[PDB]
Write an enzyme that holds these catalytic residues in place. Structure first.
Site, short mmCIF file in Angstrom:
data_model
loop_
_atom_site.label_atom_id
_atom_site.label_comp_id
_atom_site.label_asym_id
_atom_site.label_seq_id
_atom_site.Cartn_x
_atom_site.Cartn_y
_atom_site.Cartn_z
N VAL A 99 0.85 -1.18 0.00
CA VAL A 99 0.00 0.00 0.00
C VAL A 99 0.89 1.23 0.00
O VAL A 99 1.83 1.31 0.80
CB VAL A 99 -0.92 0.01 1.27
CG1 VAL A 99 -1.79 1.26 1.28
CG2 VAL A 99 -1.75 -1.27 1.36
N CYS A 100 0.60 2.19 -0.88
CA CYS A 100 1.24 3.51 -0.85
C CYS A 100 2.76 3.35 -0.92
O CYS A 100 3.26 2.63 -1.81
CB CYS A 100 0.68 4.25 0.36
SG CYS A 100 0.99 6.01 0.37
N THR A 101 3.53 4.03 -0.07
CA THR A 101 4.98 3.94 -0.12
C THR A 101 5.53 2.58 0.33
O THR A 101 6.75 2.38 0.24
CB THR A 101 5.61 5.08 0.67
OG1 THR A 101 5.03 5.09 1.98
CG2 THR A 101 5.40 6.41 -0.04
N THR A 119 3.19 3.62 -6.70
CA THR A 119 3.42 4.07 -5.34
C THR A 119 2.72 5.42 -5.18
O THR A 119 2.05 5.92 -6.11
CB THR A 119 4.92 4.17 -5.01
OG1 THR A 119 5.09 4.27 -3.58
CG2 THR A 119 5.62 5.37 -5.65
N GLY A 148 -0.69 -0.92 -4.71
CA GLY A 148 -1.85 -0.05 -4.77
C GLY A 148 -1.59 1.30 -4.15
O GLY A 148 -0.82 1.42 -3.19
#
Ligand SMILES: [Cl-]
Ligand SMILES: [Cl-]
Lengths: 226, 226
Positions: A99-101, A119, A148
């Site tokens: 997720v994300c970073t 990212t 994602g």
């Protein structure tokens, strides 16, 4: 029982983890682990205190591993113990996710080389030096890798994983039980839809972090080049 | 500093709380509290362990109070100490809010009498005996009361509260920083959109809980009638 593990580290963005955790924990015949170097308290970037349930050495072989993001990603990109654990679990996992970073941690571990990935929008330029093919889409799949964007990415992709581990009717039942039907009151969740003035403010606030992460990323890439 | 408090109780649905917590904790000049009878560990319905930060007696006057839902709502509907605390804080709060079955706790406290409100779809019939005007909408406002449906209701209404406590640009900036743009892979988050077979399964699985909560609700209503 399907074994699902989340990496829980200091300065994590807790919602990146707690969203998919509550969804996946609703499924039958799953066991969910919160993994760090030892069991015990881990503080999220907001100050929320969470508890890790297992150590690296004691974690069972995982069917799904999920790496959340947050401020704390920078340290994790140069943590050899954490990176080695991620590599070991990814070798046999059915799903490697972030997720994300969190995808920058997968990148530092060498797991994005030649792979399509995304990212967080403010850090997207750091994917290519880690060997990835950068893609500007909210959920990117490449084989068994699923990266994602957005703090709640894992809620949505958890429904996808439910449908593929079980069946579509099971995923739909969990969605209904949770009455999950989001409707944000603003449309500023992407740099392509937010007002330009808001994008500027957000980029300025991320600039020091991006600078520090450029340095970390280059060191991580040098390790991959050896 | 704006003071925001979440009630944290055993068997809470943790995402109901941790979603709005991470959003609101991103704002400047806020302080967020996790409130129970004493500081210390509280276990969510999934087994996730969270930490309460303050007791009822030590909590400052709140500008926003938020009641999450979960299995544990049944006990809270007959907890006189918790109900008295909610009533005291609601008297001066700018915003009284709930997620999912948290509105049944507001109902037991007497705070829904004559008010429009919603709750989780499977328990919606319990609103009228608590004096509410039941409404089948995802977010229902009545004065300073805001009740919302779905496990992530508080993420969306937290953006509304950000815009009203600060300004729209601040809410948009937080949305962009979090890259919050959900896109569920299924459309089964309401009994009106899910397949009938899925609705049946979900209603059957909720039936024992609904039966027990019918009994609790009638006792809570008797206390309000005195
Ligand atoms: Cl999102
Ligand atoms: Cl929702």
């Amino acid at each position: 029982a399907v074994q699902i593990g989340f990496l829980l580290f200091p300065e994590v963005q807790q919602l990146d983890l707690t969203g998919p955790h509550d969804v996946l924990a609703s499924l039958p015949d799953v066991q969910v682990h919160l993994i760090w170097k030892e069991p015990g308290p881990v503080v999220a970037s907001s100050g929320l205190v969470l508890q890790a349930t297992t150590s690296f050495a004691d974690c069972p072989p995982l069917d799904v591993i999920c790496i959340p993001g947050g401020t704390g990603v920078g340290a994790l990109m140069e943590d050899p113990q954490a990176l080695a654990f991620i590599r070991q679990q990814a070798a046999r996992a059915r799903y490697v996710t972030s997720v994300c970073t969190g995808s920058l941690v997968l990148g530092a571990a060498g797991l994005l080389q030649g792979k399509r990935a995304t990212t967080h929008w403010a850090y997207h330029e750091l994917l290519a030096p880690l060997g990835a093919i950068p893609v500007h889409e909210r959920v990117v799949r490449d084989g068994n890798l699923l990266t994602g964007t957005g703090i709640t990415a894992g809620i949505d992709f958890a429904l996808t994983l439910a449908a593929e581990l079980f069946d579509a009717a099971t995923a739909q039942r969990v969605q209904l039980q949770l009455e999950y039907a989001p409707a944000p009151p603003f449309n500023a969740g992407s740099p392509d839809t937010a007002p330009a003035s808001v994008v500027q403010q957000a980029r300025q606030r991320a600039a020091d972090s991006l600078h520090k992460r450029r340095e970390i990323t280059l060191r991580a890439a040098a390790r991959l080049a050896a």
